[PDB]
Design a protein around this ligand. Structure first.
Ligand SMILES: OC[C@@H]1O[C@@H](O)[C@H](O)[C@H]1O
Ligand SMILES: OC[C@@H]1O[C@@H](O)[C@H](O)[C@H]1O
Ligand SMILES: OC[C@@H]1O[C@@H](O)[C@H](O)[C@H]1O
Lengths: 492, 493, 140
């Protein structure tokens, strides 16, 4: 009982925008402080106050875009608090022990993006901010002439303006960003965006706040009232295994929790399909990007940690959620052009966890790093007929995607969602000229909650994958249980 | 500069419902009277009052469904006027150049016509000027197998057992000649009327709500949002009209600009179907509800000297291309479009048949339906294409292509060449085959841009064997004639 | 009714009992209309209870409902009141409780409230108080 797949290697169905592989860092818990920003004279080795171990890991992963500063924090932030002499910035401390000293602000974020080579994506404050304030932020960042804002930027140490495309006009406006009706947010959106200018040769890509989960009415109102004034519309969807008040743990979970988690993750396909169908009615040429800028798993925090800091472990279950979710974005790459997993470090479904100077790479990191070959690749036409798995055959056993990279290699990625047995897959390759050869890598575990710890940071990591044969133009593979695999094919 | 196509012969994308090949006959002009119904004692040879030359042609074409009685006539018709003893049927005669509706063709004659043809009946009830009880009683008259005044009347009138009928239109053209209704108002009437249309015995109704005219997307949105749970199908109406309303242009003797405009307006169907279907997707993402394109086709000025009210127009190779390209568009949308009905069957608009007393002819449109019948209930195959352009600014595709697999495993590939000036080279690669294949072909073409059939010369434009292709291995290279519709039949093994 | 009320045509249940409308469904239900308006009004008189009749909005007409009230309650000369007298009830009956349709959101026409409200307002307009009868109009 093999799954079967045909790849039409000569038939391109679209481009997987590299920004599908995006990330998100809020001023929350240890995502910014400790996770990234340590300060210049921290004993943690760093470049301009940003820790080097994280920088190198993220550069290796080819991080394409980073969204900051939130999240809920964005519609509470006043950006002027985070610029100027670092020592005189605004400080807040709540003992009920959270500290925001604003040492990481606009200059530090823009520097971080330059060091990583990624695009900045900033969310401005609609909920508690003013139109002038947001307009001035853009001017501060991008204007090259003389004005109070651009002069202030130069005094603060950046002589030439920066470039920025991605600009969120508020975030989470239906909830923590002002508890707004869609019709009211649409009006504020139209007003605020009006004053966000393109200075010099910078071109903004304005993004309106989109729906939470299955709020289709939100998407309809925003498209109907504001489509001509946006470049992009967001969408937020978290995979939460249990109920809100008892979500379940990141490790030590039951087999039922495995199946539920994956089934909830796959709901993304229905969401994206239905939101995109509404977008099609108002924007049939697909001008406007759909931006899935919050996704990932959300569990109860690790026992004994502060629930407000959202610290959770990351297992092979999380790797499968990431791999299957990225595949869903690939299938929707005609409309989805950016996505941002929540969140980068020490918060929710992170690629990295830190503990002082130590860090580890999660199983989620390994998926992003293995799948980077799909960034800006051409999606190829594939068709499939796959075994079922799970309690009632409710899940596909295998998720598969194929793309062609700019040097002509083909990458095929495969997730096996069953933790109990391996998955046979037969792949036929059509439309090739040459013969091809293949190598592979696989990420798997011997436990359903296999994870990395600071003491054992390499229990779950990629390994060479050799359990396939390629005879002519069939590639038959035996995927391990609970695994994510990538095959690289070279022609000639 | 060949157009290129790849057919994945092992990859099925959908089923082309046979009802895509449907037809439409209104009580208008000579579509019903003379076109079909001549009366039992006519010297025109006939079967129970229906002329035999038309019956045989329509059976050969494998007509799958026939919509009656309208059109605008349906929201004016009171069905009880069309049953019972012929001499007590309602009679209307207008001298203002003369028009007779004697109701000799009514419910029993229509159902007989469908049984003779082997096609499904599709009846449109009267919402605009009718009542809820009236429509309910029509369904009961036709379908109930028990005892009641309606079922007993049907038995008195000569049909003992009930008929089966699926397709039932709850009003027609309600935005215009069926009551000038706002969508919100129609949707409420629709919900009310449909409530009383019952499934008697083992009959199952397929209730169809009146859908949009052309690009009235608001109509589709309101009907889907207010009435989707109460319908099985939603209609759509789009005519290809070359010129303005007041001067549409002629069926023959037209300019080359009129050729290009005609075809470009026909292809607009694709955008309409796409956009209406997108709205349907929002409210019915599983595609339960059928899209029913129950009026389409060309509409020209009438033939000079004929009554404009009778809608009589000629039919040329231009009309064949419209039909072939439009059917291909329906194939591409066969995941949602499950019926279509070209307007109209005989002597009216884009007809398959024209008659003149006892003589008849088959139009170029007939030949397309008759050639493309191999696509009825076939499996649509995955094809991809990269085609030359044609027309003044390369605004048109030179070629339209569709492939399907029939129940016996043969593959049919149909191809339209939209350029009247030169032939079209097409290279087709076949993937996913086991055996070798061989191929035969037929083509419909003309030497003139307005080539048509007349009663004196009824065979100027008709299908012929097509041999101008080679099949080496799994490439099929073809040279399509100018202004042509072609079908290739491939047999494997 | 019930669902039957927005399918009933009251004229089917009056006149010589033997010539009333008959329906039979073998899939074995029989409606011979032997129990109609006169029989119901008699039943209420025998029991000493008030009659409460539901008229047909969903598949009925405004005139039909208006004529039902007139048939039952008018004491003068008209086609409806004369028909009542021929059918054996010389003086009119009294009736208060009159339902203007039933179950109109479902089996009585699958109506939106806003649409039923408009039909309600239209139908009720023509339900008159004849002689000393006073109707008590009930909306679904
Ligand atoms: O990952 C972001 C979390 O969810 C969002 O609602 C808030 O920013 C934070 O609480
Ligand atoms: O197809 C027939 C014409 O178009 C329809 O709209 C009317 O019935 C008639 O005038
Ligand atoms: O008691 C009445 C029942 O419920 C109502 O909906 C119908 O009249 C009948 O089916």
């Amino acid at each position: 009982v093999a799954s079967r797949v045909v790849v039409n290697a000569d038939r391109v169905k679209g481009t997987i925008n590299r920004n599908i592989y995006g990330h998100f860092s809020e001023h929350l818990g240890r995502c910014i402080y400790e996770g990234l920003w340590v300060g210049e004279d921290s004993p943690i080795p760093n470049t301009n106050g940003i820790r080097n171990d994280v920088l190198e890991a993220l550069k290796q992963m080819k991080i394409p875009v980073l969204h900051w500063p939130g999240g809920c924090f964005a519609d509470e932030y006043h950006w002027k608090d985070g610029v100027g002499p670092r020592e005189k910035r605004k400080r807040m401390v709540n003992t009920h022990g959270v500290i925001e000293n604003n040492h990481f602000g606009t200059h530090e974020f823009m520097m971080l993006c330059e060091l990583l080579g990624c695009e900045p994506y900033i969310s401005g404050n609609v909920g508690s901010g003013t139109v002038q304030e947001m307009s001035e932020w853009v001017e501060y960042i991008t204007f090259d002439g003389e004005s109070p804002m651009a002069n202030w930027r130069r005094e603060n140490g950046r002589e030439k303006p920066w470039r920025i495309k991605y600009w969120g006009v508020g975030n989470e406006n239906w909830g923590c960003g002002g508890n707004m009706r869609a019709e009211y947010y649409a009006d504020l959106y139209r007003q605020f965006q009006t004053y966000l200018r393109n200075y010099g040769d910078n071109k903004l890509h304005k993004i309106a706040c989109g729906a939470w989960t299955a709020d289709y009415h939100w998407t309809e109102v925003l498209m109907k009232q504001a489509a001509p004034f946006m470049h992009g519309l967001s969408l937020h969807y978290y995979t939460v295994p249990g109920p809100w008040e008892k979500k379940g743990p990141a490790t030590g979970f039951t087999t039922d929790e495995w199946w539920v988690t994956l089934k909830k993750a796959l709901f993304m396909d229905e969401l994206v399909t239905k939101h995109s169908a509404i977008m099609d009615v108002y924007d049939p040429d697909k001008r406007i990007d759909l931006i899935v800028d919050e996704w990932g798993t959300w569990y109860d925090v690790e026992p004994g940690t502060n629930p407000g800091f959202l610290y959770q472990q990351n297992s092979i279950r999380d790797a499968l959620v990431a791999g299957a979710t990225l595949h869903i974005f690939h299938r929707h790459c005609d409309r989805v052009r950016m996505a941002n997993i929540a969140q980068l470090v020490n918060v929710m479904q992170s690629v990295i966890l830190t503990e002082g100077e130590r860090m580890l790479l999660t199983p989620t990191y390994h998926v992003f790093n293995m799948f980077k070959v799909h960034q800006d690749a051409e999606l190829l036409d594939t068709w499939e007929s796959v075994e079922r798995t799970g309690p009632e055959g409710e899940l596909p056993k295998v998720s598969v995607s194929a793309s062609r990279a700019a040097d002509g290699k083909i990458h095929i990625s495969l997730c096996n969602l069953d933790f109990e047995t391996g998955a046979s897959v037969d792949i036929e390759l059509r439309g090739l000229n040459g013969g091809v050869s293949a190598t592979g890598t696989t990420l798997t575990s011997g436990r359903i909650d296999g994870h990395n710890t600071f003491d054992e940071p390499e229990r779950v990591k990629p390994a060479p994958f050799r359990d396939f044969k390629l005879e002519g133009g069939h590639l038959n593979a035996s995927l391990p249980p609970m695994s994510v695999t990538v095959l690289e094919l070279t022609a000639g």
